[PDB]
Design an enzyme around this catalytic site. Structure first.
Site, mmCIF file in Angstrom:
data_model
loop_
_atom_site.group_PDB
_atom_site.id
_atom_site.type_symbol
_atom_site.label_atom_id
_atom_site.label_comp_id
_atom_site.label_asym_id
_atom_site.label_seq_id
_atom_site.Cartn_x
_atom_site.Cartn_y
_atom_site.Cartn_z
ATOM 1 N N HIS A 61 0.789 -1.137 -0.085
ATOM 2 C CA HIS A 61 0.044 -0.159 0.162
ATOM 3 C C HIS A 61 0.878 1.351 0.053
ATOM 4 O O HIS A 61 0.399 2.324 -0.233
ATOM 5 C CB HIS A 61 -0.955 0.073 1.240
ATOM 6 C CG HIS A 61 -0.452 0.097 2.445
ATOM 7 N ND1 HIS A 61 0.026 -0.999 3.348
ATOM 8 C CD2 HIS A 61 0.090 1.205 3.309
ATOM 9 C CE1 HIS A 61 0.593 -0.730 4.272
ATOM 10 N NE2 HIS A 61 0.703 0.723 4.435
ATOM 11 N N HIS A 64 8.072 2.089 3.202
ATOM 12 C CA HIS A 64 8.601 2.540 4.611
ATOM 13 C C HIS A 64 9.934 2.485 4.687
ATOM 14 O O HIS A 64 10.744 1.642 4.134
ATOM 15 C CB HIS A 64 8.053 1.456 5.677
ATOM 16 C CG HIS A 64 6.612 1.402 5.705
ATOM 17 N ND1 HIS A 64 5.872 0.555 6.653
ATOM 18 C CD2 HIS A 64 5.762 2.250 5.516
ATOM 19 C CE1 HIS A 64 4.730 0.604 6.984
ATOM 20 N NE2 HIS A 64 4.276 1.828 5.870
ATOM 21 N N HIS A 91 7.858 7.539 6.126
ATOM 22 C CA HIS A 91 6.757 7.287 4.945
ATOM 23 C C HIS A 91 6.107 8.530 4.375
ATOM 24 O O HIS A 91 5.760 9.472 5.243
ATOM 25 C CB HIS A 91 5.905 5.939 5.270
ATOM 26 C CG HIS A 91 4.686 6.173 6.219
ATOM 27 N ND1 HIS A 91 4.969 5.579 7.436
ATOM 28 C CD2 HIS A 91 3.698 6.978 6.038
ATOM 29 C CE1 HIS A 91 3.954 6.496 8.209
ATOM 30 N NE2 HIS A 91 3.047 6.968 7.236
ATOM 31 N N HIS A 93 2.230 9.578 2.087
ATOM 32 C CA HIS A 93 1.107 9.386 1.479
ATOM 33 C C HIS A 93 1.018 10.413 0.209
ATOM 34 O O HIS A 93 1.323 11.568 0.225
ATOM 35 C CB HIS A 93 -0.171 9.606 2.442
ATOM 36 C CG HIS A 93 -0.196 8.730 3.813
ATOM 37 N ND1 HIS A 93 -0.871 7.656 3.863
ATOM 38 C CD2 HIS A 93 0.793 8.817 4.880
ATOM 39 C CE1 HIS A 93 -0.449 7.260 5.010
ATOM 40 N NE2 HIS A 93 0.422 7.976 5.603
ATOM 41 N N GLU A 103 -3.140 13.806 3.857
ATOM 42 C CA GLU A 103 -4.007 13.112 4.660
ATOM 43 C C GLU A 103 -4.706 14.265 5.444
ATOM 44 O O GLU A 103 -5.760 14.509 5.433
ATOM 45 C CB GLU A 103 -3.501 12.172 5.458
ATOM 46 C CG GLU A 103 -3.134 10.918 4.982
ATOM 47 C CD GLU A 103 -3.077 9.597 5.444
ATOM 48 O OE1 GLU A 103 -3.754 8.600 5.166
ATOM 49 O OE2 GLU A 103 -2.244 9.364 6.602
ATOM 50 N N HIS A 116 5.143 11.461 6.906
ATOM 51 C CA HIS A 116 4.937 10.975 8.456
ATOM 52 C C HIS A 116 6.263 10.779 8.699
ATOM 53 O O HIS A 116 6.780 10.000 8.266
ATOM 54 C CB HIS A 116 3.914 10.046 8.288
ATOM 55 C CG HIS A 116 2.508 10.511 8.274
ATOM 56 N ND1 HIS A 116 1.435 9.750 7.830
ATOM 57 C CD2 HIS A 116 2.295 11.804 8.108
ATOM 58 C CE1 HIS A 116 0.353 10.609 7.632
ATOM 59 N NE2 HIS A 116 0.775 11.980 7.807
ATOM 60 N N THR A 196 -3.161 6.493 10.799
ATOM 61 C CA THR A 196 -4.133 6.737 9.902
ATOM 62 C C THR A 196 -4.806 5.532 8.770
ATOM 63 O O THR A 196 -5.425 5.768 7.799
ATOM 64 C CB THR A 196 -3.755 7.919 8.598
ATOM 65 O OG1 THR A 196 -2.465 7.384 8.036
ATOM 66 C CG2 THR A 196 -3.438 9.251 9.560
ATOM 67 N N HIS A 197 -4.108 4.545 9.269
ATOM 68 C CA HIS A 197 -4.407 3.207 8.536
ATOM 69 C C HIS A 197 -4.533 2.125 9.545
ATOM 70 O O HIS A 197 -4.040 2.129 10.929
ATOM 71 C CB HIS A 197 -3.771 2.890 7.154
ATOM 72 C CG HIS A 197 -2.316 2.593 7.529
ATOM 73 N ND1 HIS A 197 -1.156 3.481 6.978
ATOM 74 C CD2 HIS A 197 -1.675 1.645 8.218
ATOM 75 C CE1 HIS A 197 -0.071 2.973 7.259
ATOM 76 N NE2 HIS A 197 -0.392 1.784 8.038
#
Ligand SMILES: Cc1ccc(SCCC(=O)Oc2ccc(S(N)(=O)=O)cc2)cc1
Ligand SMILES: [Zn+2]
Length: 257
Positions: A61, A64, A91, A93, A103, A116, A196-197
């Site tokens: 997804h 990292h 990581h 997004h 996000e 992040h 957030t996941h």
């Protein structure tokens, strides 16, 4: 099993992770007319040792970058914290187009991506595993990424992706200080929230930078060209991995500025 596609995406996470509908979910829309300036917030202090950089991993997804976290070589202090937090990972997004991808949002504005930088409370807890489910366990710095000029400080990260193109691939990734990715100003917002996941633990103190950093349209294309599939399967580009904003449910976003 969970993902970002229609069937396994954010709208469906509540089925195996009911905390998805909790009172401290992230990310959020920061409304700047509703933030409370807090006089007691100290400056954010990051001190990272480039020798703690370990490995870059395609996790399907996302990707990292993991750090050695056996000691206090790489720490976050100050801001709202009494405790020292130990760096473990950074990581990004991103979104399917330049229009969205962050996000967090600020006054409803959506940026193209978000960085992040994650830490765990090594003052209170002896491992990331112990810290991860605790209210005061995790500290994540978020930096909004605004599409524009190419960001040279991303070069080592972007140059590394060709070796981890498909899911499960990993490579050494060493001698890197991620504080070089942070904006000049460490003026910030903070609020209590979550991963957030999945598993969406409500364990995160969020530090959101006021200043954005840049990223080019072509740098974002490099993220989206990473493959979610394992080698030999048909190619499935990592087009997006941003969770929508979640209700504050009475939380207060504090401003350092
Ligand atoms: C199976 C399993 C069990 C526990 C965890 S919890 C520890 C890793 C973590 O903390 O991973 C994240 C860090 C930051 C963020 S974010 N996007 O910055 O909120 C997400 C996951 C994860 C997976
Ligand atoms: Zn994240």
């Amino acid at each position: 099993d969970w993902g970002y596609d229609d069937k396994n995406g954010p709208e469906q996470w509540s089925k195996l992770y009911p905390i998805a509908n909790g009172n401290n979910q992230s990310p959020v829309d920061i409304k700047t007319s509703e933030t409370k300036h807090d006089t007691s917030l100290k400056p954010i202090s990051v001190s990272y040792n480039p020798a703690t950089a370990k490995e870059i991993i395609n996790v399907g997804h996302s990707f990292h970058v993991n750090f050695e976290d056996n000691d206090n070589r790489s720490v976050l202090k100050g801001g709202p914290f009494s405790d020292s937090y130990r760096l473990f990972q950074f990581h990004f997004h991103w979104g399917s187009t330049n229009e969205h991808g962050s996000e967090h949002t600020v006054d409803g504005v959506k940026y193209s991506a978000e960085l992040h930088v994650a830490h765990w409370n090594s003052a209170k807890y002896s491992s990331l595993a112990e810290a991860a489910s605790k209210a005061d366990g995790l500290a994540v710095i978020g930096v909004l990424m605004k599409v524009g000029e190419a960001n040279p400080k991303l070069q080592k990260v972007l140059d590394a992706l060709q070796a981890i193109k498909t899911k499960g691939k990993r490579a050494p990734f060493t001698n890197f200080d991620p504080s070089t990715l942070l904006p000049s100003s460490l003026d910030f917002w903070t609020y209590p929230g979550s991963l957030t996941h999945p598993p969406l633990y409500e364990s995160v103190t969020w530090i959101i930078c006021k200043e954005s950093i840049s990223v080019s349209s072509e740098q974002l294309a490099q993220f989206r060209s990473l493959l979610s599939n394992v080698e030999g399967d048909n190619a499935v580009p990592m087009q997006h991995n941003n969770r929508p904003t979640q209700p504050l449910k009475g939380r207060t976003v504090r401003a350092s500025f």
